[PDB]
Structures are given as C-alpha cells and as structure tokens.
C-alpha cells in the first residue's frame, strides 16, 4: 500500500476529481444532447413533398 502511495501521491485526489468529473459530465451530456435535439428537431420533423405541376 505504501509503495503504491509513493508511486501516486494523488491516488485519492485523482479519484475525487474523477467523482466530480463524472457528476459534471453526467449533467452536461444529457442536457447538451437535449439541445442537440432541440436544434435538430426542426429538420427531424421536416416533411418533404414532391408536387410536380403535372
């Protein structure tokens, strides 16, 4: 455990950053996707119709 400690004095800290990081991305991703889906809904609902004058 100690030799591990020296090799990475920030094992704990890195892991605290990874926790908060997960949470942050956990809130940003869903939201960003939603927006990705607001600004892309317009097209994803676009209905095309071909009306040759005939």
């Amino acid at each position: 455990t100690f030799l591990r400690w020296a090799s990475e004095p920030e094992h704990d800290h890195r892991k605290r950053m990874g926790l908060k990081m997960l949470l942050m991305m956990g809130l940003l991703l869903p939201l960003t996707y939603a927006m990705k889906r607001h600004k892309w809904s317009v097209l994803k609902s676009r209905k095309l119709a071909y009306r040759p004058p005939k």
Binding site: V42, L43, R51
Partner: protein, 399 residues
C-alpha cells in the same frame, strides 16, 4: 372634422342597417355577411367562392342575364368579394337608384337561384382560373403563410378551396352554405354617400326583411422550392393580436415605421387572431441579407424606438385609415367591416385619439410583446435555397 356620423339602425331580422350620408351624388350600397372560409368544414371548402360566382347569374326574379342587365342599365357597378371571414356584395350607383340598388341586393342574398346549368360552368371557371391562379405568386405565398401558420385549423384552408372540392360540389351543398351562413343577425346593410338613413331603413324593412334568423397560430415553415422562377417571394409573420385588440393601433404605427425589394408589411386581422409581418420579393442571392435586414428592424423598434420616427409613423397612419370621403366604396367597405367585426363604426376622432396616445415607450413594449422571441411562420416560393432555415430565423428573432 365635422365627421358625418354613421347612423346605424337595426332591423328585426338583425340586418343592422347602417349608413353614412355624404354629399357625393353616387353611393355604394353593400351587404356584408360574417361568412368565409373559416366557417367551412373541409367538405365545403369552396362553397363561398362558388356561391360568389353564382350570385350574379340570375335569381328567380332575374333569370339569366336579367340581374347583370338591370344593374348594368341603371349604370351601376356590381362587385363582390370573399375573404376568410367576410363576404361582401356591393353596388356603386347613383344615389337616386337606391330603390333598386337595394331590391337587387335583396335578391342576391335571398331568393337567389343556383341554376345547376350555371353551376357547371362556374365550376369550370373557378377550376381553370385556379389552374392559373398559380401565376399570382404573392397570393400563393400568402395562402401558405396561412396554411403553415394555422395548420389543423379552418384558418389554414384557402378561400378558393382545393380543386377537389371545386369539382365535387352540388346545388344542395351550396344551398346549405347559403341557408346556413346567410343568417339575418350576421348581416349588415351598409350605405355610404348620398343616401338618407330613414329611406334606407324603410327599404330594408320593405326588402331584406325576410332573411332568416380554437384558432391557433403554429410557428412553422413551408418552403416551395422551384428554381426556374426569376424572383423569390418570402413572407414572415407572427401572431397578430386580433381585430378587437386595442394594441392593433400601436402595431400599425410600428408597420408605419418599417413601411431589399417590394418589402411590404401587413397586419392581417381575424377574430381574435391574425398575421403580423413582412413580405418581400428578392433575387435569390439576396434573400438572406434581406431577412437579416428585416429582423434587425423589428428589433430596432423593440428596443430602440425614437419619438421622431414614431411621429413619422403616427402621421402616415393618420393620413391613412381615413376612409372619409375617400369615396363611397371605400367608406361603405369600412362600415361594412366595422359592423361585422367591432359591432360598431369607430369614428375617425376615436382613431385620432388612439393614434395620439401612442408614444415610443408603449410602442416598444407592444413590439416586444408581439415580435421579440416569438416563433414565426415562414413561407417561401421560388429560388429559396439561400433563404435561411428555421434556427437562423429563430435566432434572428432576438438579440
């Protein structure tokens, strides 16, 4: 201004006969009816238009060309029009002829005869013209600015209707529309010019005393791309307040502030709804720059008005919306709508008071209420590839 007040005397059936005597020797006697394409239920989508075609082709009393002949002999001009909410049949004629200008109108609203023979021809007329009505690009743009803005409602459907219904229509259907939407309480007999109100009331009592007694705006976009056309027509609108809403006047002043190419501005009003916006025709390459220009302007009023410009706008409105001695026809027309929409004729002094109470602060307040961060309806026709899609116009609706 010594405005000739509009004396309006009502009748038993409810014809609400109205009048505004004027020195002009000729007069315009019309019948308005609160019946348009908004009252049609997609099975009779062209009934008002096709009845408007059939209404001058003879009534029992005037079989064949009699109607047109007499109204021709008397020397009067016979006109009719139909909108999405109102139908009008009016005659411009020498005042002395009121006696017949009124009896003729009575036949046109009741006792009308829809000869099936004629019905056939009018069908062809309407259909063929429609086949060419496509030439009126502007009307096309404005009948989609209606379709895409009022999707799923009776306000999307056009006055003319789809060719389908036109072909598939019969006397009985027409008879229904006639017998259903031609009620006496929904009718105004309006007269403007050299008419006496008591004589017109007596004529309405003698004739015409027999007449029987959730619209939603959807922010959307329709794009008809056809690259062979030389010019592109684009209309962008938001939801107009309505006909009765007071803020309409502060919006008219805003339109008077705005006034690429053919950049007109419109405030079309229906019963508690409407379309407020701009229609412009430009070469394709400039459509986007126009749009950008236009959106900036609306925004200018919303946050940066100027008393000076407001004044410019109040004055143009003032010289406008006069409908006074502008002529018998226009005046009568205004009365015709005023009794159908407001239920009363608003005098020009009240219009001047509502204009002079408008300042810059309430103009930018009302413009922020109706233009800022609103989802518009866009209708384009022509080479409209450089016309921006909905997110860019969406984002240009705010700063």
């Amino acid at each position: 201004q010594s405005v000739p007040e509009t004396q309006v005397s009502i009748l038993d059936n409810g014809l609400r006969v109205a009048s505004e005597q004027s020195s002009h020797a000729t007069c315009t006697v019309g019948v308005w009816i609160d019946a348009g394409s908004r009252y049609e239920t997609e099975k009779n989508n062209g009934a008002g238009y096709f009845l408007e075609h059939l209404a001058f082709k003879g009534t029992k009393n005037r079989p064949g060309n009699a109607l047109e002949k007499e109204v021709e002999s008397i020397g009067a001009h016979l006109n009719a029009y139909s909108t999405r909410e109102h139908t009008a049949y009016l005659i411009k004629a020498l005042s002395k002829d009121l006696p017949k200008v009124v009896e003729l109108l009575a036949d046109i609203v009741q006792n009308s005869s829809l000869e099936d023979s004629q019905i056939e021809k009018e069908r062809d007329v309407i259909l063929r013209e429609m086949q060419e009505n496509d030439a009126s690009m502007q009307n096309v743009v404005f009948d989609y600015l209606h379709a895409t803005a009022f999707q799923g409602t009776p306000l999307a459907q056009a006055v003319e209707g789809p060719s389908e219904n036109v072909r598939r229509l019969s006397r009985t259907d027409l008879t229904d529309y006639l017998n259903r939407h031609y009620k006496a309480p929904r009718m105004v007999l309006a007269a403007a010019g050299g008419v006496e109100h008591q004589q017109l009331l007596d004529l309405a009592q003698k004739h015409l005393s027999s007449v029987s007694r959730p619209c939603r705006f959807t922010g959307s976009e329709i794009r008809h791309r056809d690259d062979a056309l030389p010019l592109a027509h684009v209309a962008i609108a938001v939801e107009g307040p309505g006909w009765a809403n007071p803020d309409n006047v502060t919006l008219q002043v805003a339109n008077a502030i705005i006034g690429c190419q053919s950049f007109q501005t419109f405030n079309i009003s229906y019963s508690d709804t409407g379309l407020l916006g701009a229609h412009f025709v430009c070469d394709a390459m400039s459509i986007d720059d126009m749009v950008f220009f236009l959106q900036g302007q609306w925004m200018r009023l919303c946050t940066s008005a100027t008393e000076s410009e407001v004044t410019r706008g109040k004055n143009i409105l003032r010289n406008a919306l006069v409908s006074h001695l502008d002529g018998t026809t226009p005046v009568c027309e205004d009365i015709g709508r005023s009794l159908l929409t407001y239920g009363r004729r608003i005098p020009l002094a009240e219009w001047e008071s509502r204009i002079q109470e408008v300042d810059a602060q309430m103009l930018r307040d009302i413009c922020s209420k109706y233009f800022y961060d609103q989802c518009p309806a866009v209708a384009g026709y022509g080479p409209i590839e450089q016309l921006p899609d909905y997110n860019r116009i969406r984002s240009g609706m705010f700063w």
